[PDB]
């Protein structure tokens, strides 16, 4: 039998109506017979302490997860991370950067309704992720939800109230479950062979600016003066912003102070393609990356001992399948 | 039949290679389908200057609303040609500024210029004209890729696609195929009486995205600001960070209107009731486009902070779904 | 909108276990499996009673006598329960839902057909969730129509078709939106109501009736129509192209006109997954209509087959059947 | 993924104008009308466009009146012009466009130039027509994205022709490819999907001609009997397509199975498809009765594949095998 490790980090899946209650998720799984059917892999559940609402997660929580995977890596055939839905895509994106040369599947899942509440998706998303980790292994950080497996660094929580909570707007899913499980012909991510390398991260102050009609030079000035190390712009369309000379001079001053300024689309899908004023102002195009990928990629790259110039070039390069190259 | 007014404000649809005055109208004169018997009569007004929609300011919404007001009595319907990058903001703003609207106002444009090969500009404009004449809905709407959406429900979702706009929390109002079908989407609250056009004045508003590792400093900075939109996780959650929550209550105690929306493409905010205790108002399933233009509208009127806070959670123009 | 019913009293739902994939094994097996699944016994759930059919049937072996058996079992238990779930094989579930819609007049309680693509006994079963949702919907959202619940959506039965053979989203309603969608919350869609009678349930008989189903395709001959004009045939369904077009061939049109002359009901449908028949649009006259073919609007083949079974089994003459076939009787078609 | 061809030389595309809604006027064909409307539309004459030559068929046909002889006529027209043009666009009525595209896929072997079938739901230059954009796109794809397959272009997607079906009678998105992603999608940019390649031969184009073949199309529905089947045996029939439930299920009662086994004993090729819009046949029982599974083929691909194979001097065993084999990209192997 394959053996799967399950990191139970918290989230809706394990909660009760009144809140997280320690031991409750595992008491439920003990009284559902589907989990110890002979077709199932063996699995072990590690309950984290404390159990966290994913909306309370900080980048240091990504580290604690990556180090948990690293400790268990040699002893199991694959890894399932149970997680709250609110920041699931940010965790899946972070783990894709931090886990280099990954040689076993890592699948992040959870539920929109608690295992404890009626009509829960928990039992079905967990059973599917175990079965998929054992039988259809893909050596990438993935997110499994509502009968699809997505590349983790391509995912976004798209549908706050739906069982189809997550989308992968710029990439098809990797696998789809029906009567059969079907691997799709989605191109593989760049994929290192060799020993697993797990990259620690350190806190990094990053701002996220949304472009909208009437935005002022003040917000950029704002982030210049509380030293941020990086600024993500959610720009219109394929990466457009108002022509405003004061706005542009603040972006230019940020880059002159060594702040990494990255331009993403605010649209749910599409690719940035930016005379060329933002570029003139030292802004880097983020291609079709999500904000989740872009933020976690910055945490990854700022934590390594890299020059601003090296970081600015690495931000537009496909490191782990997060973006579609030219 | 009918007579349709066309406001050509700028945008991709009219560009070459750069907007160029007279290029859109020179192109339409060489395409027979427009002047054809089953079409309505229409007139194009070219704005001066023509604008990339990414350069629009809230004052540009006022110029468009006032243009519609001047033309309202003399035409059966109104088509607004606009760049795609901020089309949903303009459609949202016009829905609040135009009260008791009694004729269709449809915003459209193209993802490829009329002058480029494979342009969608001809078909989106012809469809808008035909629908404003023959299938009038008395609301501000956005027509794109064979669907008509409620304008204050729209968002530019697909930067590279012909299907560039979505209405994530509301089905379209109409769909075009061999026939044009009205869908059974519930009507918006709709005043009858004389058109009223609400002018707006500049208002400083900030837009904060919640993400892992956000600090209290962002909120502390915005504390030159009359309102703050939070793009929260899921159904409206944010980290429990006491410093963060203390800056939000300090914002609300200084009379700043703080509105919680979802960062998800679709869903409804339903908010330890910590944000609400910190004076944050839930914005239900409103888009950022609708919330931002609704705050410009309400802050421009003679209303105190408490009336604006109450109005932000009410369905004024079909922008949100009650209870 | 579908009604939001009171939750104040504990409901009792009758489950007609007809057979299907849900109860199968690699019997009494379904009922023991539900006893062992604690979700089915929570305070928030309705009480339910399973009637296991003898024998249990693969839905591929269903006939119209089976639709009648199920209608009789609903009528037998109607006054005793608050609603009905029909557990059924996926292959012909849309035919059954469509038939029940026409047979059950003055229906004042929900009837929901469901099942699963994978057996409850197998890993990755959808049966637990489709059945649990059906029971919870029958108790709490008690729409007085025959409906079909699959993969978090409730559909009007007589608008459904099995569209995806391998998918958990097996069913669609190609010409009407779903009545209800389930997520964190159960949402009711603006779907306008079907025609509704009043008083005690009346079950209209549905008998076996010889009906031929002709697919129009390039190279089809006059001999196919001539072939069905032999033996008993009472009605023909033409699966035509697009908005209802067929070859303009004189032998073909003459064989069709011969059929309507002899009292055969000939109904024109689209072969397409969605859209609406509108005859005569792409040549000068209206050739099929002049041959006495009746337009079936946007009906599915499932709805059309069961509607003909229903109307031929009633006390109606040929002219009245022809007229009724293009009339919206139960929400199966969208009027002009 | 579809090739991105050179733009350096001006291409020449041949347009087979068979008929169809695209060229009609108010509900009738008129000779010369489509060609004059195109002369009058500047976008078709821009420098970035290929050169094109229209052959107007006589008479122009409603595609609902097409027979298999019409597939033969189109294949021969392609073969007659093949060396002279860089690509081929077939303008056609929507109703049977998917059957034509399927038929051409089997009939054309060693195809080294694109062949794209397109048309419109509304007649050209008629209000709200999709004909200008479906034809402009087909010509630009044929010139620039020269996939060596028979394809179908509609509503900003290029589909593999022998995977397509008219799914939406009233919609501008009329066609679907339910069991394969599209080859190409058009937006601001033309995107190629990495849809893997069909089998490709090499050398000069070879046309595999067809000759009439009586084929029956049986829908499985509740109450169908061994007699309904025995009736399909009471004409000249050489092959029977069953549109079975779900993953290829039919009544398992002994009469029905004996009737199907008698059909196969008489040398009839009986092929089992799903009646579903998507999915794959997976059947003892029917197999024991001589029935061949058609995997995830459409009815359009199965019917045209049988016209191709039955018109060849092949024994029944060889045609049965060939029916379950992926010859042109029409089906997904196990
Ligand atoms: N997750 C995403 O990045 C979606 C979208 N680009 C946004 O800016 O929120
Ligand atoms: N237009 C929208 O508001 C989409 C999404 N709620 C966002 O925060 O960007
Ligand atoms: N179920 C349906 O009726 C779909 C399609 N009209 C068919 O002819 O099978
Ligand atoms: N075109 C198709 O084959 C769709 C569906 N399998 C049918 O039987 O019609
Ligand atoms: Cl949602
Ligand atoms: Cl790697
Ligand atoms: Cl896009
Ligand atoms: Cl003004
Ligand atoms: Cl109850
Ligand atoms: Cl499927
Ligand atoms: Cl349709
Ligand atoms: Cl001339
Ligand atoms: Cl060219
Ligand atoms: Cl050769």
Author numbering:
A (entry chain A): 3 to 20, 25 to 280, 286 to 337
B (entry chain C): 3 to 19, 25 to 230, 233 to 280, 286 to 337
C (entry chain B): -6 to 19, 28 to 337
D (entry chain D): -6 to 19, 24 to 280, 287 to 337
What does the report in the manuscript say about this coordinate set?
L-asparaginases catalyze the hydrolysis of L-Asn to L-Asp. The genome of E. coli encodes three L-asparaginases, called type I, II, and isoaspartyl aminopeptidase/L-asparaginase, respectively. The active site pockets of these enzymes are shaped by two protomers, one of which forms most of the active site scaffold, including all catalytic residues; it will be referred to as a “major” protomer, with the second protomer called “minor”. Yet, as we demonstrated here based on the reinterpreted structures of EcAI and the new structures of EcAII, under some conditions a citrate ion can be accommodated into the active site cavity and even displace the canonical substrate or product.
